[PDB]
Amino acid sequence: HQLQPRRVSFRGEASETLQSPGYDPSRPESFFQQSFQRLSRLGHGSYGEVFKVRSKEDGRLYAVKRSMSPFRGPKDRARKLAEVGSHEKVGQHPCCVRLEQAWEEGGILYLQTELCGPSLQQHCEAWGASLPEAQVWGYLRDTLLALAHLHSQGLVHLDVKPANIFLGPRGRCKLGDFGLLVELGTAGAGEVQEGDPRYMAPELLQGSYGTAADVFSLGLTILEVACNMELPHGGEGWQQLRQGYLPPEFTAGLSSELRSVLVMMLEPDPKLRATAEALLALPVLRQ
Numbered sequence: 001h002q003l004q005p006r007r008v009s010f011r012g013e014a015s016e017t018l019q020s021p022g023y024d025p026s027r028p029e030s031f032f033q034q035s036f037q038r039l040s041r042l043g044h045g046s047y048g049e050v051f052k053v054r055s056k057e058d059g060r061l062y063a064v065k066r067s068m069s070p071f072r073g074p075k076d077r078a079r080k081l082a083e084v085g086s087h088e089k090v091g092q093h094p095c096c097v098r099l100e101q102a103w104e105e106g107g108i109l110y111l112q113t114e115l116c117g118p119s120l121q122q123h124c125e126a127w128g129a130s131l132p133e134a135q136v137w138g139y140l141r142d143t144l145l146a147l148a149h150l151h152s153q154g155l156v157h158l159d160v161k162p163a164n165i166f167l168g169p170r171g172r173c174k175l176g177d178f179g180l181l182v183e184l185g186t187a188g189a190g191e192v193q194e195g196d197p198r199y200m201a202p203e204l205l206q207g208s209y210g211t212a213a214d215v216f217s218l219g220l221t222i223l224e225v226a227c228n229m230e231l232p233h234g235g236e237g238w239q240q241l242r243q244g245y246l247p248p249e250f251t252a253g254l255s256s257e258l259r260s261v262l263v264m265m266l267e268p269d270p271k272l273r274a275t276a277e278a279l280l281a282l283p284v285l286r287q
C-alpha cells in the first residue's frame, strides 16, 4: 500500500489532499506524472532534476524540481523540506522567483516554482562575449532589490551565483534557488552551509556570515558576467579576490562607475562592505 502525496507547507493552513485534473488517486503513476506534462529537462545534478512542465490544473508553465532518491531518514527529510520553508519565508517579490507549491510522494520532494528565462550563467555562455553594461547594471540592480528584500527580513541567501539569477524577460531578472537560505538567529532545522566556493565571502573561511556575504557573492557574480571571465576555485587568484585586490587583468572594458561599485561590494571587511540598501540608494542605480 502507498501513502498519498501530501502538500509540504509551513504556513499552518489545513492538512489537505492534492487533487488535480488528470490525477487519479487510484492509478499507480505519481501525482507529478498524472497532473503535469513534462516538456523538457531544464537540468540535473545530485539534487535530482528540474523539468519544464505544463500544469493540467491551470494550463500554464512552471519549473518542477524533483529530488533524486527517497529521504534516507527523518533528519534527511527535515533538511530537504526546509527548502520549502525558506522559499515561503521569502514571500512575494518581483525580483524573487515565486514558489507555486510543493509536495512529497514516495520520499521524493517536488518543488514547483514559476518558469523563468535562462539563468544568467546560461545567458552568458550563450552571449559569447561580455554582456552590454546596460544589461549588467540592470542585473546588478534587480538582484540588489532581491537581496534588500531578503536582508530586511533577516534572511541570507548564502549561495548567490550566476546560476541562481534568472533572466526575467526583459531585461529584468529574479533571484531563486533558496535551498541554503537561513533566517538569522532562529536557525535551524538544519545547520547552515557555505555556498559555491567560487563566490564565497572571505569571512566564511572562519565561520562568520551575515547579510554582507550575499553582497560579496553578488559582487563576484557581476564581475564574472561583465568581464566574461571565469573565477578561480582556489589559489592566490582566489585569495587575492578576497583581499580587496583585483585580478591583475583588472576588469578592463568596465567603466570607472561599475568598477568602483564592485569594489564596495568586494570589500574584505564585512563591516565596511556596502549594504544593498545603500547601494540601491546610489544614483547610478535608480530605476
Ligand SMILES: CN1CCN(CCOc2cc(OC3CCOCC3)c3c(Nc4c(Cl)ccc5c4OCO5)ncnc3c2)CC1
Residues within 6 Å of the ligand: 042, 043, 044, 050, 063, 064, 065, 111, 112, 113, 114, 115, 116, 117, 118, 119, 122, 163, 164, 166, 176, 177, 178
Ligand atoms: C535551451 N533553453 C531551454 C529553455 N530555457 C529557459 C528556462 O531555463 C530555466 C532553467 C532552470 O534551472 C536550470 C538553471 C541552473 O540550475 C539547474 C537547471 C530554472 C529553474 N531552476 C530551479 C532552481 Cl535553480 C532551483 C529550484 C527550482 C527550480 O525550478 C523549480 O524549483 N527554475 C525556474 N526556471 C528555470 C528556467 C533556456 C535554455
